Write a protein that binds this ligand. Sequence first.
Ligand SMILES: [La+3]
Ligand SMILES: [La+3]
Ligand SMILES: [La+3]
Ligand SMILES: [La+3]
Ligand SMILES: [La+3]
Ligand SMILES: [La+3]
Ligand SMILES: [La+3]
Ligand SMILES: [La+3]
Ligand SMILES: [La+3]
Ligand SMILES: [La+3]
Lengths: 226, 226
Amino acid sequence: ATSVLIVEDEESLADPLAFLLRKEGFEATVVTDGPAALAEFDRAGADIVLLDLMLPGMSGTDVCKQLRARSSVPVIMVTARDSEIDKVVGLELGADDYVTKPYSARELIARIRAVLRRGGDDDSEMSDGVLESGPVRMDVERHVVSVNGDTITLPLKEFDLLEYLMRNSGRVLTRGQLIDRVWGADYVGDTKTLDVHVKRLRSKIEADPANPVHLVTVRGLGYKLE
Amino acid sequence: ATSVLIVEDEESLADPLAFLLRKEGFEATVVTDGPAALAEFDRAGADIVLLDLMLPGMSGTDVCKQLRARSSVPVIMVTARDSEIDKVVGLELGADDYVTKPYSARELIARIRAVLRRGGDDDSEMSDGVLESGPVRMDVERHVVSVNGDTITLPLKEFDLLEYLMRNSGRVLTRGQLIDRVWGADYVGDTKTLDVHVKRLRSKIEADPANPVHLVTVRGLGYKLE
Ligand SMILES: [La+3]
Ligand SMILES: [La+3]
Ligand SMILES: [La+3]
Ligand SMILES: [La+3]
Ligand SMILES: [La+3]
Ligand SMILES: [La+3]
Ligand SMILES: [La+3]
Ligand SMILES: [La+3]
Ligand SMILES: [La+3]
Ligand SMILES: [La+3]
């Protein structure tokens, strides 16, 4: 039967695939690094190779070239998390990030603005340590928020919105400021989306999300966290 | 203001990003190949570089290394369509495909089975030319189907289902065969999903999708295209 060599350092991704392959009549062998991959290919061969692009020691890039050097027969499919391809282009090209295209222009602008303010660090924007305002605490470097207890998923946009409001506690931020920061650039329907997001935060942060007293609207101006 | 160098061979991706950047107070310069990128960086510099990974001539991989060699300051973000990263890993590593992880195991199995039958070619599975059955015509190599006129989106699963039924016109295919081929491996709820997909095809292929006469159910066995 067709032989699949799975080269993968996450046992919990590899084992279920290996299970399914086997129940479907394929042979599957799982190995966890480049040396073990090359030894097993030489021992037994493989018809299909599924290759983790980021491995400890010998890079997946080098494993791939070495397998291909041995035979033109095997199908070799390289696999990577967003975070692994980001690491690989850093090590291999000196790139700061990899992004799959078509991508939202505005979202890319929001990421550019973030880089320029050293986004994701407590020590950015002349601050230090965890942000606090009323019962809300935000650990920016760890990406966690509590409202006494740890507050559930904040989707990314809600987190960014709250961070920007907490960093400017007691001061009004305008719709334009808030939109540029969280969504990147102004766009059709942005004011409504901002308000939906403010209301979602309110339901997670406020004693009564109906008459809010912490995340308030400043009519004609924008929003403020007191 | 912050300068963004956009290195991109698709004017219709680059120009709208450049527009938005400019309206948000950034400088943006768009160039369309590696030589032009390196000349412009040397002329004017850039704070941010957005770099198409696949370019004509000098590869985006080589541009990236050459820009980084010049300065450690610029943020360099490499961008690629699914199809461009697939091409790059072929040229650079000898890999047949790149896949972003976590990925459906079953879907990966369906792609393995497809490779093994030389999927997507008219000449595969002892056939030749376009498939025809009743009013339905399928050009497998071009990925187009007509029912007299060109039949709308067939989502991929519907296309695969129909192809497999057309290749075996007049013969019953079982639920197990159909599931293994289109979805890759058996799974919880597969029989129902198969039927939903058969009904969706019926609404696109059949005179009356209520009493079907072309794509028929064979009770106890599976489905058949007459
Ligand atoms: La173990
Ligand atoms: La194990
Ligand atoms: La890994
Ligand atoms: La990334
Ligand atoms: La703006
Ligand atoms: La033009
Ligand atoms: La132009
Ligand atoms: La390109
Ligand atoms: La791919
Ligand atoms: La099966």
